[PDB]
Structure 1
Amino acid sequence: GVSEYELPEDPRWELPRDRLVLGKPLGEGCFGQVVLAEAIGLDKDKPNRVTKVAVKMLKSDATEKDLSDLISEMEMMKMIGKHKNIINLLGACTQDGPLYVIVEYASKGNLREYLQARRPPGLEYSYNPSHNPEEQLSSKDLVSCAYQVARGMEYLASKKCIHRDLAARNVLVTEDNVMKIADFGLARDIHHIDYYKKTTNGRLPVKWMAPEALFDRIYTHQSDVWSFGVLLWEIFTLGGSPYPGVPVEELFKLLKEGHRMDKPSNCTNELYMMMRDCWHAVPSQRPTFKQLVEDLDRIVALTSNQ
């Protein structure tokens, strides 16, 4: 029972449950549930204002370890602090019920789904799967997505945070088209990892791992930079799947032999070189997120929004 555990109450973050008006499901995961909610008076200055938020909670079959992870993720987000380009912590409910972790809500879904819905019916992209498509994104908008994500990672890096699974599905898009990085404070599994098991959404996270993380389970900022390269490829394929036609068992040998993904049809040479630099075999030779932010900042200014 949740009453049988000692939940860490933080007065600065604590919100009464009856201030939340729970709504539609936002998605699932390992053992966590996330719902949409309306928070009444999230800010003490405006107690009569409503704010759309996302609420994460434990499922019916959650164990003691799951609770420990959810708390761990919450306290981690506290320590890392706030940034525009990450999913921020807004509050928590630790009393009179199950643990609720309140975070920012992104209404336009993850980056893969966001981009796929805005795929032009053209030659250079796969088909738009959305039955209700949205307006095509400009070239500047695409580089802008990359910059924002890189900026968020640059911040997380400065807070000694290693994401270990940076991907398009782990980036969320707000109503104002702001890119926000998700799941950056997840507890690392203490057991060895299944290279072949899919996520609840059918994704193979193996395809984002750097070679050193893949072969020796070594995770650094440099390995995140590798992942950012794969994300860059995802953006300019508008939500494409990494290494098309390549099975996981063959991905081990291919990567070691120096094989990398081809440049997407709609992608500048300069942006592809950036992917390749991120995909450098030697971790120390990959660019830092600081350098990535500086380049992408320059490229955004020079990229046409026409």
Structure 2
Amino acid sequence: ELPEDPRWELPRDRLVLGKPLGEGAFGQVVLAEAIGLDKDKPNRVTKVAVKMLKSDATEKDLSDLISEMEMMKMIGKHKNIINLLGACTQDGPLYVIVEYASKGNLREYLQARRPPGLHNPEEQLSSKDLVSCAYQVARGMEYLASKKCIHRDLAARNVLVTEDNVMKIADFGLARDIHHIDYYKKTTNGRLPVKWMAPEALFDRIYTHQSDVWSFGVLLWEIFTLGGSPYPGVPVEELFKLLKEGHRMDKPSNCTNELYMMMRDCWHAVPSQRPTFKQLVEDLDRIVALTSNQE
């Protein structure tokens, strides 16, 4: 039923399906092993993530999956985004093969590395490490912006960490125009997505790279609170009021005033006055070089 694309096509028999990994807006995604993903590496297996359709999936659900795959092909590859590795489209269910991130999303990664409870973590992140995650996400966002891709839901839950601690933006090719969004719908973790949305995207339904910069500011706040949850206990109706009044989240402890000013700039009420990702990459780059890893 679907057209063949020899660029990305991998034979179904070269893929060994493993355990689930989804149930988090990412759809039903499973871990797998791909044999000979590369033409020069036929005898080598690579762990990958595989997206597919559920049992009762309408012809529409199929439409969106195909578009996400096309979108990824157009956008191209980058170190800081979940990349497309291949696809199984002939003789069987549709399989979109993408990069696997063994350490999960950034929110979980940060929470699991929080300081000891007075909870007993096995690894801790230095200040340089934190600024470095911020830098990588900005790098991935800058690349996406350069390809005219507007994310629309930038948040730590949508940033993934590979076994080598590389940050990767996911869900950037997700089907759009679904902006008929239910402001009261909670994330699988129990948080309201509206808390990461620029006021113009939230009230005037206008989405731009500038609104993605506003989200990135919230994301920076998440990184420095070690996976803190914005506006805890605040319901949608009250969030609208907080934004109409120009309220801004407070400064996280263990956060330099410069990083907090960066957050405040991303939260400028005027979209054109917010920095760009190009500017954020440069600032963060400089700051990383100057931030101490307690060495």
TM-score norm. by structure 2 comes to: 0.97
Partners in 1 of 2:157 and 2:207 — Cα distance?
19
Residue 246 of structure 1 deviates from its aligned partner by: 2.0
Distance in 2 between the 1:93 and 1:178 partners?
A: 27
CA shift for structure 1 position 122: 6.4
Deviation at 1:133, TM superposition (A): 2.8
Contact 2:26 2:171 in 1 (8 A): no
Q: Does the aligned pair in 2 maintain the 1:31–1:61 contact within 8 Å?
A: no
In structure 1, distance between residues paired with 2:51 and 2:89: 12
Distance of aligned partners of 1:84 and 1:8 in 2 relative to their CA distance in 1, 3 Å threshold: same
Task: Report the CA distance shift for 1:121/1:190 in structure 2 as closer, same or farther (over 3 A).
Answer: closer
**CA distance 1:200–1:244, change in 2 (3 Å):** closer
Does 1:51 pair with 2:46?
Answer: yes
CA positional deviation for 1:150: 0.1
Structure 1 residue 191: deviation in Å?
5.7
Mapped partners of 1:32, 1:8: distance in 2: 23
Q: SS at the partner of 1:36?
A: strand
Counterpart Cα distance in 2 of 1:31 and 1:67: 14
Question: What is the CA distance between 1:29 and its match in structure 2?
Answer: 4.1
Equivalent pair of 1:55/1:103 in contact (CA under 8 Å): yes
Quick check: 1:31–1:66 contact (8 Å CA) kept in 2?
Answer: no
Contact kept, 8 Å, 2:217 with 2:263, in 1: the verdict is: yes
2:271 aligns with 283
Question: Is the 2:110–2:227 contact (alpha carbons within 8 Å) kept by the matching residues of 1?
Answer: yes
What is the deviation of 1:134?
Answer: 3.1
Encode CA deviations 1:171-228: one digit per residue, 9 max, x unaligned. 0000000000000001113462211111334331111000001101110000000000
SS of aligned partner of 2:28: strand
Deviation at residue 245 of structure 1 after TM alignment = 3.0
Post-superposition Cα deviations, 1:80-131, rounded to whole Å, max 9, x if no partner, equal 00000000000000011110000000000100000000000268xxxxxxx6
For structure 2, the residue ranges without an aligned partner over 5 or more in a row are none
Q: Could you tell which deviates more after superposition, 6-15 or 153-162?
A: 6-15
| Root mean square deviation of aligned Cα | 1.4
Q: Is the 8 A contact 2:211 2:271 kept in 1?
A: yes
CA–CA distance in 2 between the matches of 1:59 and 1:275? 39
Aligned partners of 1:139, 1:8: CA distance in 2, in Å? Answer: 49
| Distance across 1 between alignment mates of 2:178 and 2:48 | 31
Task: Give the Cα separation in 2 of the matches to 1:134 and 1:19.
Answer: 36
User: TM-score w.r.t. structure 1 length?
Assistant: 0.93
Give the deviation of 1:303 after TM superposition.
0.2
1:30 is displaced (CA, Å) by: 5.0
Contact 2:214–2:267 under 8 Å retained in 1: yes
Q: Does 1:107 align with 2:99?
A: no
Return the alpha-carbon distance in structure 2 between the equivalents of residues 50 and 280 of structure 1.
47
| Alignment check: 8 A CA contact 2:115 2:121 kept | no
Residue 30 and residue 228 in structure 1: after superposition, are their counterparts in 2 closer, same or farther (change >3 A)?
closer
Identity %: 100
Describe the shift of the 1:232–1:31 C-alpha distance in structure 2 as closer, same or farther (beyond 3 A). Answer: closer
Q: How many residues align?
A: 294
Is the 2:16–2:32 contact (alpha carbons within 8 Å) kept by the matching residues of 1? yes
Name whichever of 270-279 and 30-39 sits farther off: 30-39
In 2 relative to 1, CA 228–31 (structure 1 residues): closer, same or farther, beyond 3 Å?
A: closer
Q: In structure 1, how many angstroms separate the alpha carbons of the residues matched to 2:230 and 2:179?
A: 26
SS of the residue corresponding to residue 108 of structure 2 reads helix
User: Which residue in the other structure is 1:147 paired with?
Assistant: 135
Q: Is contact 2:18-2:30 (8 Å) kept?
A: yes
Give 5+ residue unaligned stretches, structure 1: 1-5, 124-130
Q: Judging changes above 3 Å, is the alpha-carbon distance between structure 1 residues 122 and 200 closer, same or farther for their aligned structure 2 residues?
A: closer
Q: What is the DSSP-based 3-state SS (H/G/I as helix, E as strand, rest coil) of the residue aligned with 1:52?
A: strand
1:68 aligns with 2:56: no
Distance 1:205 1:8, change over 3 A: farther
Alpha-carbon shift at residue 244 of structure 1 (Å): 2.2
Shift of 1:11: 0.2
